[PDB]
Amino acid sequence: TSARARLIDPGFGIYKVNELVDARDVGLGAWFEAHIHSVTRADEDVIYHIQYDEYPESGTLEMNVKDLRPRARTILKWNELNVGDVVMVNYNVESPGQRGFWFDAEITTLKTISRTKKELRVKIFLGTLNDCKIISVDEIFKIERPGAHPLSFADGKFLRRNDPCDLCGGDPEKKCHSCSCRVCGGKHEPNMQLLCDECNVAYHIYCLNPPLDKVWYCPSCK
Numbered sequence: 547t548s549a550r551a552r553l554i555d556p557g558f559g560i561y562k563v564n565e566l567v568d569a570r571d572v573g574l575g576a577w578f579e580a581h582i583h584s585v586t587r588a589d590e591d592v593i594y595h596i597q598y599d600e601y602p603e604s605g606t607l608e609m610n611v612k613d614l615r616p617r618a619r620t621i622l623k624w625n626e627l628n629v630g631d632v633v634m635v636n637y638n639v640e641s642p643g644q645r646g647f648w649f650d651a652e653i654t655t656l657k658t659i660s661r662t663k664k665e666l667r668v669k670i671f672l673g674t675l676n677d678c679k680i681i682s683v684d685e686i687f688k689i690e691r692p693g694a695h696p697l698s699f700a701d702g703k704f705l706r707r708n709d710p711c712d713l714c715g716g717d718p719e720k721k722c723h724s725c726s727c728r729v730c731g732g733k734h735e736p737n738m739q740l741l742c743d744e745c746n747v748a749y750h751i752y753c754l755n756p757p758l759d760k761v762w763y764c765p766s767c768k
């Protein structure tokens with residue numbers, strides 16, 4: 547058992563040490579994946595510190611409890627959505643056509659145009675922005691509330707799709723040297739292919755020079 551993936555109840559607080567949460571960055575108004583680092587004493591007397599999963603460089607940070615909630619885990623299907631619902635959506639404020647960040651929003655328009663076409667417009671809570679068109683209609687997340695089952699890293703990483711690919715367009719059919727194996731460009735075998743942490747590019751076990759016997763950081767760095 548990893549120490550990073552074991553929940554600790556220090557005897558108080560509504561989130562457990564090492565619990566997976568989302569943390570609202572007050573500067574942007576968006577929610578980012580994080581974990582509880584510590585729960586200590588000085589909604590008032592309990593202090594929570596976190597680390598952001600994808601910003602370990604930012605270190606340990608104090609966070610008010612109103613800016614924390616259990617990690618988002620459930621994607622709401624189209625038929626589970628209603629006008630007036632408050633859900634978490636991906637939106638880019640500066641470039642509405644592109645992938646952005648994860649914002650709480652109230653659904654104001656729900657329109658099924660055809661079998662494939664849909665119109666989802668929301669009110670984004672930053673101040674608020676009205677009549678925002680959400681492109682990623684298949685990634686609408688339910689907002690979890692205090693008391694939800696505590697997740698740990700043992701359950702999984704529970705990372706959302708947080709990056710913008712220009713090459714293959716995210717299509718699983720087309721080969722890609724950019725977002726898959728650099729040597730051959732084959733997405734086949736997600737299991738027999740290791741990633742890097744610093745630069746983040748992949749290689750198969752048999753595509754490296756020299757080839758590895760069994761299944762990490764890349765060799766071209768060192």
Ligand SMILES: [Zn+2]
Pocket residue numbers: 711712713714715716722724725726
């Ligand atoms: Zn690609």
Ligand SMILES: [Zn+2]
Pocket residue numbers: 727728729730731732749750753
């Ligand atoms: Zn390869």
Ligand SMILES: [Zn+2]
Pocket residue numbers: 742743744745746747763764767
């Ligand atoms: Zn690397």
